[PDB]
Write a protein that binds this ligand. Structure first.
Ligand SMILES: NCCC[C@H](N)CC(=O)NCCC[C@H](N)CC(=O)NCCC[C@H](N)CC(=O)N[C@@H]1[C@H](O)[C@@H](OC(N)=O)[C@@H](CO)O[C@H]1NC1=N[C@@H]2C(=O)NC[C@@H](O)[C@H]2N1
Lengths: 144, 200, 63, 117
RNA sequence: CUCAGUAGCGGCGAGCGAACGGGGAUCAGCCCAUUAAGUUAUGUGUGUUUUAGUGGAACGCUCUGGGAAGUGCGAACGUAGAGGGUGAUAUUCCCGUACACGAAAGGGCACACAUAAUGAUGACGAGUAGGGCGAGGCACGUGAAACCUUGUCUGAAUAUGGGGGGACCAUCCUCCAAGGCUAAAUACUCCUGACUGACCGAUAGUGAACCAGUACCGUGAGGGAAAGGCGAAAAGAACCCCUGUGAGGGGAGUGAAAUAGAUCCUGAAACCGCAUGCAUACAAGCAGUGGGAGCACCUUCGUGGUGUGACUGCGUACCUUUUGUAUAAUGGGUCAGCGACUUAUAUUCAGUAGCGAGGUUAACCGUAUAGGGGAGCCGUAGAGAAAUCGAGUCUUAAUAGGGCG
RNA sequence: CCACAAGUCGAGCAGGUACGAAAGUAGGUCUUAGUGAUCCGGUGGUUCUGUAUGGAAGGGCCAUCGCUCAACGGAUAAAAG
């Protein structure tokens, strides 16, 4: 035990890799699982993803819709349970960023009623949902 | 946990660093990762594009009765390119911080319970003499051993340099392969305390 | 290299909780001849069929 | 990690050629021909392990027929008579006795025709 | 390194593909005519480095053997147990290694002074900014197209002034173009020194281990090979015999070995001889297979072993491609050697290990697989085109109904 | 009903209607053919967005218009020997 020639991995951790075209007995000899002839049997034989043989594809016979909002890319959603990572009792955008629950380039945050909290927090400048506000006040915090 | 040094003194060492249950799969993964990270991986071959010459078509496509050929450096031909030419490779693996620490803790605990770890209050040599170090180790009955000290004295390092099956390392420079390879590990109490603080 | 999104498919599909939603065809024009029921029932979003979900996943790997 | 094939390939070819000993011409000298010849020999042996049982049963039946006709019976009637007499000696032993012991076979035929009567 | 294959561009196809912000490496500013930082030369001084080199520990007996470094028994050195060689495998036989020393004379670099010279025809920027026409560059294909460059035609204001903030206007914010110089972090290897390899070992590895860009081919540009090994030491065979004073061989001699004798280690296969045993000149075919007499040698004397195989039942090769092949459809004269599912990145699923409502670092630092580095990524919440709300949300006049959760 | 994209029938609820004295009937025509996806554009509306801010341009959403794309799942805006 505990020698360089007495260490082994757990069962099922390692498998042999598949080797094609090495005889009848291996079961993947000759054609190597590619079947007989055709486009897919050639080297680099697959067709482009989304190609359906020539008919108008699924992503082209359907219409485009919608537009992308720019403010959504900078609005951040925060779970209530994530407040436990905040050091101190003041919950603000800066302290959430310091706790790494909000990415540094975000300009605003919203707190949703997802988990549970026990500490009493003071929330300054962050939007709260109706459930999250009740949860904070029940736990003993206040808003601004 | 309570351990006994060679002189009968009692030492208190944390169970986290020196008493973890042995996890062979974790230890094996970390050890093989260390061995793989030891590789150099310097080599290459020449593909059909790299071999000298071979730009022109050797003979015409039809009419000669030969098998059709495109270049004399084809990988089918003797002296042609290698089909899949190798390039230098990087053999390092990622090891999770917690996985490395847990493997080292398991190794240390297993050494303790197999009685291959020997604790000493102090381990120093007066002069850089190979014979001095040899006699000192023969007294402790650890002629083949890895010595771990809090700091590596120059005299000790010089005395140990020429001895086969003996190496001396700092407490902060232990590695899983060397902990397993040597027959015994002779550790000073200060080095043991430093390793305790590091928790493996 | 990183997988590249097929941008047309990205413009046609958006992800829901357990699938992908899409708009319906046959509402862009030629609308007078269509009955009121078709006009109101071809409005809104529907789900991508399970036969096409795999292709959509291959085309849009990051949504 | 370059691997040279010579030792193992030579061993395999030599084993095939050793199994092909005694065959005519290229069948015992040339690897391709010899390899085709060994596989076909195995196929023939597999088929003939089944054919052998039929051939030996036919031989036993012919010898029993000759003995029965020496004793005044046909093979089919003698088999039927033994069946009715409850004798369960098989055709191999019956043919052995027919070939090597005429008196015992005469007694067996007498028992068969006594059961037939 | 991230942001991010995101925002966008695109016969809105195939594809192309940012920036802002954040984390690191390195950090540095100085001037426009009395003119700066800096750079380059020459000389002097100091320091360091480099071009020859010197010393450098410690082993005996015994057995096998042609030969000892190998066996068995004891001993010594180690700041030296890296490596190479010596008749087989050596810390103590040799060259070396650790370590301690060493330079008439020359070269490189670093710092400090001295003198030159440069920076430096330039003094706040007019045929310039802007505009019309045609093109080019920007992730951005004329698009709602800002911004940069200009071939052509024009053309300001000039600090109460001018440029930008993606058509454009107003307001705010921010900078000062039409004059310059500037180290580091970055890119590379013809070449020099040291060291290294889960890189090759003569069809491999450079085309080339060898008198190779040679022989050879071509008018020429150009193309382009094959070819390594006696033995520890030549001790490379005096002399005799056959033969043409040839080639070649038989003795002799050397050698541990000559079937190591010169294209000489080992010495496979295809292919070609000689010798012995059995079968074979009245019998029709993929050449075998299942039976089976006789003969020869051996023998444990047999219900045995080896070789052969009279006679007999059955039996039209292999691969590929095909509805289907003995097919008179394809491919292979034979042997030996080589010859085809790989590598990097991303992503998804399954096993397995760590940790677990959490998991995990990247670049980078680090005498460095450790330890630091939390930027970022994934999970923890959906609905909606979106603004917005949020265990709900969208649609609607509707708390009805319905869709996604 | 159906590979997808599509196609078909529909009781019932709310609002506003028409015809009936009323119970009621009516979401085109006895039914099954009379048709064309996506892209790009035009028109009406809009308690959506709007690249510093207020606007605007542009975009989104709802309704609707431009095909013998008839080789009628339509490879190009654009093609004979
Ligand atoms: N019982 C039967 C009795 C029968 C009776 N007696 C009849 C009989 O007996 N007839 C004998 C006939 C035999 C045969 N016909 C004679 C023959 O052949 N003479 C050959 C005469 C000339 C010979 N060619 C020269 C030769 O050898 N050059 C080589 C060559 O340049 C090269 O080698 C290779 N490979 O490239 C080089 C590489 O090393 O070495 C050289 N040489 C070296 N030697 C040295 C060595 O050893 N150490 C040191 C160094 O000097 C080495 N270099």
């Amino acid at each position: 035990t505990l020698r360089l020639n007495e260490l082994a991995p757990a069962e099922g951790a390692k498998r042999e890799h598949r080797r094609l075209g090495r005889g009848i007995g291996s079961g993947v000899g000759k054609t190597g699982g590619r079947g007989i002839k055709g486009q897919k049997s050639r080297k680099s034989g697959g067709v482009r993803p989304g190609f359906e043989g020539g008919q108008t594809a699924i992503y082209r016979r359907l219409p485009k819709f919608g537009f992308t909002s720019q403010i959504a890319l900078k609005t951040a959603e925060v779970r209530l349970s994530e407040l436990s990572k905040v050091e101190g009792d003041i919950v603000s955008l800066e302290t959430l960023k310091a706790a790494n629950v909000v990415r540094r380039d975000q300009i605003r945050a919203r707190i949703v009623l997802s988990g549970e909290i026990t500490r009493a927090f003071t929330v300054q400048g962050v939007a709260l949902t109706k459930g999250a506000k009740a949860a904070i006040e029940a736990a003993g915090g206040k808003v601004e | 946990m309570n351990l006994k040094t060679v002189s009968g003194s009692a030492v208190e060492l944390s169970e986290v660093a020196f008493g973890r249950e042995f996890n062979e799969a974790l230890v094996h993964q970390v050890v093989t990762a260390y061995l793989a990270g030891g590789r150099q991986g310097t080599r290459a071959h020449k593909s059909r594009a790299d071999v000298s010459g071979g730009g022109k078509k050797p003979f015409r496509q039809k009419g000669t009765g030969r098998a059709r050929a495109g270049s004399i450096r084809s990988p089918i031909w003797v002296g042609g390119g290698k089909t899949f030419a190798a390039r230098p490779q990087d053999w390092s693996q990622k090891v999770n911080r917690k996985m490395y620490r847990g493997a080292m803790q398991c190794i240390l605990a297993e050494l303790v319970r197999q009685d291959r770890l020997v604790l000493v209050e102090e381990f120093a040599v007066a002069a850089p003499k190979t014979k001095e170090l040899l006699a000192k180790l023969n007294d402790l009955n650890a002629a083949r051993a890895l010595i771990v000290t809090d700091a590596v004295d120059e005299n000790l390092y010089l005395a140990a340099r020429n001895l086969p099956h003996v190496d001396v390392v700092d407490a902060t420079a232990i590695d899983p392969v060397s902990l397993i390879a040597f027959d015994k590990v002779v550790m000073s109490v200060a080095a043991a305390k430093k390793i305790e603080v590091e928790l493996g | 290299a990183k997988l590249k999104t097929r941008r047309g498919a990205a413009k046609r599909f958006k992800a829901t909780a357990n699938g992908f939603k899409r708009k319906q065809a046959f509402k862009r024009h030629i609308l007078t001849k269509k009955s009121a029921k078709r006009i109101r029932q071809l409005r809104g979003c529907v789900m991508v069929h399970v036969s096409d979900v795999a292709s959509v996943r291959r085309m849009c790997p990051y949504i | 990690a370059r691997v040279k094939r010579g030792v193992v390939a030579h061993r395999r070819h030599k084993k095939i050629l050793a199994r092909a000993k005694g065959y005519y011409g290229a069948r015992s000298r040339v690897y391709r021909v010899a390899f085709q010849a060994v596989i076909k020999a195995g196929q023939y042996a597999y088929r003939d392990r089944r054919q052998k049982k039929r051939q030996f049963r036919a031989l036993w039946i012919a010898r029993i027929n000759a003995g029965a006709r020496q004793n005044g019976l046909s093979y089919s009637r003698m088999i039927d008579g033994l069946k009715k007499a409850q004798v369960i000696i098989d055709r191999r032993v019956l043919a052995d006795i027919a070939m090597h012991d005429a008196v015992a076979f005469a007694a067996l035929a007498e028992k068969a025709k006594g059961a037939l009567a």
